[PDB]
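Good morning N.,

You mentioned wanting to compare the apo and holo forms, so I went ahead and generated the holo version with uridine-5'-monophosphate. This is what I fed in:
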Amino acid sequence: ELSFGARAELPRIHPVASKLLRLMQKKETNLCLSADVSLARELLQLADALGPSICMLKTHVDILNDFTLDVMKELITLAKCHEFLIFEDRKFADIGNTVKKQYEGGIFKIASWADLVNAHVVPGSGVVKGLQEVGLPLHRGCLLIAEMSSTGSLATGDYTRAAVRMAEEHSEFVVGFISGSRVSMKPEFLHLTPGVQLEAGGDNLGQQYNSPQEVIGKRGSDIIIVGRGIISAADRLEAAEMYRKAAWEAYLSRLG
Ligand SMILES: O=c1ccn([C@@H]2O[C@H](COP(=O)(O)O)[C@@H](O)[C@H]2O)c(=O)[nH]1
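and this is what came out, ligand included:
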């Protein structure tokens, strides 16, 4: 079991994964902020204040009421300044020919600003092939959704195994997983886990929470993704620091 810094140097590492792992090690953070807000100003103020505490900022561009490409330029300035990646949680899930256009084009031009995107595996490997046609030339990476945090998830058993095989067969572009646990035994792949809070509970629409210690320490994931546990708190900086310290110590204690 290797440190993030050592995993950044693995022979088969993807450049996006390497950049991420190096800044995780440098900044002692394995926290991804889920910036689930509707105002550009709030997104940018969170990115600036929490930038030092996070390895990654996850977006849902399609809920920003005042999206423009200039907002994403300003977010990139902050990502470069504070050293974090931008992950658009778009969950591409269509045929290859369609997702290529949804990734490159339209109003959002996701591929122009997102270091990482993700995809569901249910359509078969054409979803990855279509994305990679845009993402490989743009030096991007992708995460496959192997497990989900929500009640009634069908991403279990053979489905999870299919996601791992699809990732391991598209390693030029796929850099890891959305999962609740370590699902790949190959250390070149990242594991990012949403459904994380310090306290037990859930929401009223099927979200289920587990703690950083559970998902990083016991379940062997790499990165926690935290939305409301930070966003709904009064002091979002202190909340981010609490989640960062929790995830980082769970990782260290796992390492030995
Ligand atoms: O299995 C998954 C994959 C993605 N997300 C996303 O991660 C965030 C979780 O936010 P919260 O429940 O921490 O507020 C949301 O943006 C949600 O869309 C999940 O919650 N579960």
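The two ends are 9 Å apart (CA to CA).

Happy to go through it together on a call whenever suits you.

Best,
F.
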